[PDB]
Design a protein around this nucleic acid. Structure first.
Length: 78
DNA sequence: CCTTGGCGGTTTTTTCGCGGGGGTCTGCGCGTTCGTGCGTTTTTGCGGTGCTTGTGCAAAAGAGCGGCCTCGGCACCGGG
């Protein structure tokens, strides 16, 4: 379901960054880099959860993993 | 305080970037049809109470009996 990140949505995301024109081949590249980033953060959150002896990933594990990667997130109980 | 290799100014050379010009194609813009998301109400699962099913802990007398012992009576060893 990587195709679920649809073309208008990624167009909107590029548009927030101030981009005027979009190449036709860029969408697969953005899907790939988003997959890589999500893979890394999800992996770290999952092993945090497995150390915590839990079966449900909470928001704290996600914020912890992100802050450990230098991508500190405010607003979710950090 | 000694030393010398290298920065620095100067003069030739050489070469890459930008602009102009041109051409091409491809995302952008808009219209039409289709999908599949958020929003509700319904369904299945986890739990508790109440009810039902299992089960541990007074002489007296006779009759009959087993063990037993004396005894009867016999066969047998030793010798000729």
């Amino acid at each position: 379901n990587i195709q679920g990140i649809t073309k208008p949505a990624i167009r909107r995301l590029a548009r927030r960054g101030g981009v005027k024109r979009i190449s036709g081949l860029i969408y697969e590249e953005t899907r790939g880099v988003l997959k890589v980033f999500l893979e890394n953060v999800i992996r770290d959150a999952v092993t945090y959860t497995e150390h915590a002896k839990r079966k449900t990933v909470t928001a704290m594990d996600v914020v912890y993993a992100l802050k450990r990667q230098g991508r500190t997130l405010y607003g979710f109980g950090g």
